[PDB]
């Protein structure tokens, strides 16, 4: 049954090439560049005493949650820098953290195979472990909320799972990835999500039934970052090959590649502005860069972090961008 | 400027900051140890003697609180989560001597040691190597010579010489000899003395870190 795999892959590539009548590079040539997008560090969130690997912005564009190796989640009031909540973690090894769209729940996890959900609206005040999503056989890489009751998870098992917090058990398991899944991205409509894995491939999945809609390839190394375009018809990915690639779901292939000779290191996080014109991705060597989603030019540099920019997030309204880093500090730009 | 509730929110943030600082100060004195080895290297036995995913074992010895990370259950890609342990004071390595002729786990253990010790994240991290289950090595070697797996071995197939050669080959894999040190030891099923050796290694690592801070190392 594997003899026809190469033939089908060749047919898919031929169809993609036939439908590739033009490229975004020649289509956006006449569009004026966004210019130098200068951003200042409006806020400097301090209080973390260990390497920070994940963060998530709130739907209100004010509250954000960050995770560090100190085994605790800190809810930051970005407008005033106040720490809304401090949530000790039973496991000090946390690699991902998510903030519920309604804000009533916060989830995180990591080397522990549980994407523990924390209830911020607890009656007793102190934040408790509402549920533990056990069942994964590998380190958790990312679990993003869908609603108060549904949440997706990605881990090192090479598979993603959909969980119901009330039930506490998997309801839809996503399989097909050969490499470890490192990131997740939820579409604006919440109907589809794309997960990047270490096999240099990004796959589109359906939450309702778990079927893989599409498979994306082109990266030369492991994929560590993924984020949807605001319209939901495209998404960008960041891999260890130091080049960010933009994929359109309908086109089912790469559209633009963002890379520079100066950058010779992998990508850690990727995000899009509200309009999606500006592509912001975290990079090694302790600085971040902004790429024009259309012109692919380096719009600007978000420098100031003393360590790797592990995570990057943009407010739903696009008012500000908060970048986490291993120096235990989050800076809002 | 700030209202009554805003002042209360700032006070709550200050209390959270104080709690965070206290927790960080407590954790700074805590000793972080990483446990690695083959599937049957005996790391589980070691942690049991001292005391699905990562397992944290906490124990205390001579005023030092030690927390060990058993990452043997992590079957995922190593480089995607090994970097999290960059801050570990020392890395404990478990190797089963008896598995020299058991099918070639010694080869896998040596590859693991080469990958971990030479990793960019552990350039300055010392490795506390442990040779587990020599009570089986001393007997099996009598019947099965060590030359079966490694023709390069020379001399009589005695437990002492074989152990010395295996140790020397282990520290031969170290490409950062001038930057890190390997503290090899044999478990011998001696809980008290094994924990004493671990404590001595931790103390030596802390002393070298202090000397580095002083510029002497």
């Amino acid at each position: 049954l594997r003899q026809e795999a190469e033939q089908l892959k060749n047919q898919i590539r031929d169809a993609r090439k036939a439908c590739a009548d033009a490229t975004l590079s020649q289509i956006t040539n006449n569009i004026d560049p966004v210019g130098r997008i200068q951003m200042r560090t409006r806020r400097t969130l301090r209080g973390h005493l260990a390497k920070i690997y994940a963060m998530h912005w709130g739907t209100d564009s004010r509250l954000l949650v960050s995770a560090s190796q100190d085994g605790k989640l800190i809810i930051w009031d970005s407008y005033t820098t106040n720490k809304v909540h401090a949530i000790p973690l039973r496991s000090s090894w946390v690699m991902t953290c998510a903030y519920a769209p309604s804000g009533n729940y916060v989830a995180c996890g990591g080397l522990d195979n549980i994407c523990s959900i924390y209830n911020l609206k607890t009656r007793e005040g102190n934040v408790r472990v509402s549920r533990e999503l056990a069942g994964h056989t590998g380190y958790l890489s990312c679990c993003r909320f869908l609603d108060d009751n549904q949440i997706v998870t990605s881990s090192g098992d090479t598979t993603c799972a959909l969980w119901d917090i009330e039930t506490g058990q998997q309801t839809t398991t996503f399989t097909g990835h050969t490499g470890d899944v490192m990131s997740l991205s939820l579409a604006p409509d919440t109907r589809l999500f794309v997960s990047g894995a270490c096999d240099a491939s990004a796959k589109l999945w359906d939450v309702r039934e778990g079927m893989c809609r599409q498979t994306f390839t082109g990266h030369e190394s492991d994929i560590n970052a993924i984020c949807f375009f605001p319209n939901g018809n495209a998404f960008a990915t960041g891999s260890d090959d130091a080049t960010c690639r933009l994929f359109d779901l309908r086109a089912d292939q790469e559209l633009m590649t963002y890379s520079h000779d100066n950058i010779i290191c992998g990508i850690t996080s990727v995000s899009f502005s509200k309009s999606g014109r500006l592509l912001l991705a975290g990079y090694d060597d302790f600085n971040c860069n902004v790429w024009d989603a259309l012109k692919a030019d380096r719009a600007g540099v978000l420098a100031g972090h003393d360590n790797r920019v592990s995570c990057l997030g943009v407010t739903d309204d696009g008012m500000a961008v908060a970048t986490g880093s291993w120096d235990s500090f989050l800076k809002i730009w | 400027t700030l209202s009554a509730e805003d002042k209360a929110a700032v006070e709550r943030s200050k209390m959270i900051d104080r709690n965070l600082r206290e927790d960080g100060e407590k954790a700074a004195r805590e000793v972080k140890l990483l446990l690695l080895g083959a599937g049957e290297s005996g790391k589980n036995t070691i942690v049991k003697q001292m005391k699905t995913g990562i397992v944290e074992t906490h124990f205390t010895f001579k005023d030092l609180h030690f927390k060990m990370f058993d990452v043997g259950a992590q079957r995922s890609e190593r480089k995607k989560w090994i970097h999290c342990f960059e801050g570990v004071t020392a890395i404990i390595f478990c190797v089963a001597l008896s598995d020299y002729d058991l099918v070639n786990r010694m080869h896998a253990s040596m590859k693991l040691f080469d990958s971990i010790c030479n990793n960019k994240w552990f350039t300055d991290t010392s490795i506390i190597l442990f040779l587990n289950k020599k009570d089986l090595f001393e007997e099996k070697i009598k019947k099965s010579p060590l030359t079966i797996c490694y023709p390069e071995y020379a001399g009589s197939n005695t437990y002492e010489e074989a152990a010395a050669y295996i140790q020397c080959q282990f520290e031969d894999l170290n490409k950062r000899k001038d930057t890190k040190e390997i503290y090899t030891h044999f478990t011998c099923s001696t809980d008290t003395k094994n924990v004493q050796f671990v404590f001595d290694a931790v103390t030596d690592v802390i002393i070298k870190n202090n000397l580095k801070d002083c510029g002497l190392f």
Partner: single-chain antibody, 229 residues
Framework: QLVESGGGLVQPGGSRKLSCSASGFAFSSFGMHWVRQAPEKGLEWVAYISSGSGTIYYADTVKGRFTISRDDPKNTLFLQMTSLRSEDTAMYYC??????????????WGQGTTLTVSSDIVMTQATSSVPVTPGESVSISCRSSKSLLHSNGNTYLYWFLQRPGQSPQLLIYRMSNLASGVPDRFSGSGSGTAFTLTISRLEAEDVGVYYCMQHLEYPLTFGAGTKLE
């Protein structure tokens, strides 16, 4: 759950100890307020102690006369009272509050205990009485002498409903957010200085006294109280 103890008849100028045992919640992380209600008059703020006793405030009528302390290990709130005056007779309510973005201060009020002795913003509720019947819509108007719309955009106003023979319960906080467990019937809106409470499809349990409270700066003040029957 909050229970108050240390009441009873006292002579004028005497001293008594009030104990407010706290259970069912993290008393350490919750700020505590003391509110005293006379047998017929409205609520009156007494004192406030923040979490960890880092900040303590008292009303002008009791400043320098009443002291408030906390003991987290015992989960009990203490209020040492000395030089009790004749007017001090009132039912003291132990109020729970936590202050952070999106929080609901004064959400939970204790049952309270009755004690008998042998510049600030003032809320106006001239509409003392407004008869209502089930299924009818009624509006309660509250006015303040100072604009409660802070520079940050938060209008620090609170609505409390007290049923006959029951302690007050938080109804609306910040003039726009309904406290947990409050039916969606109640609504809150108003201008910088003009405030009003809207009740839709009023039903039997809505009967009670509604109090308008301001939290822009201490000391806290409560309205006269609108009685619905």
């Amino acid at each position: 759950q909050l229970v108050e103890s240390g009441g009873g008849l006292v002579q004028p100028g005497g001293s008594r100890k009030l104990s407010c045992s706290a259970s069912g919640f993290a008393f350490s992380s919750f700020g505590m307020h003391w509110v005293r209600q006379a047998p017929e008059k409205g609520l009156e703020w007494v004192a406030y102690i923040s979490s960890g006793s880092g900040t303590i405030y008292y009303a002008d009528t009791v400043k320098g006369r009443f002291t408030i302390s906390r003991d987290d290990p015992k989960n009990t709130l203490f209020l040492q009272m000395t030089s009790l005056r004749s007017e001090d007779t009132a039912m003291y309510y132990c109020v729970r509050s936590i202050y952070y973005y999106g929080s609901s201060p004064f959400d939970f009020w204790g049952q309270g205990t009755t004690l008998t002795v042998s510049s600030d913003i003032v809320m106006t509720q001239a509409t003392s009485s407004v008869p209502v019947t089930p299924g009818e819509s009624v509006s309660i108007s509250c006015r303040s002498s100072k604009s409660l719309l802070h520079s940050n955009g938060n209008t620090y106003l609170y609505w409390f409903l007290q049923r006959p023979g029951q302690s007050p319960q938080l109804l609306i906080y910040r003039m726009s957010n309904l406290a947990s467990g409050v039916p969606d019937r109640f609504s809150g809106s108003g201008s910088g200085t003009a405030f009003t409470l809207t009740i839709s499809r009023l039903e039997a349990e809505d009967v009670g006294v509604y109090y308008c409270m301001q939290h822009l700066e201490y000391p806290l003040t409560f309205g006269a109280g609108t009685k619905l029957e």
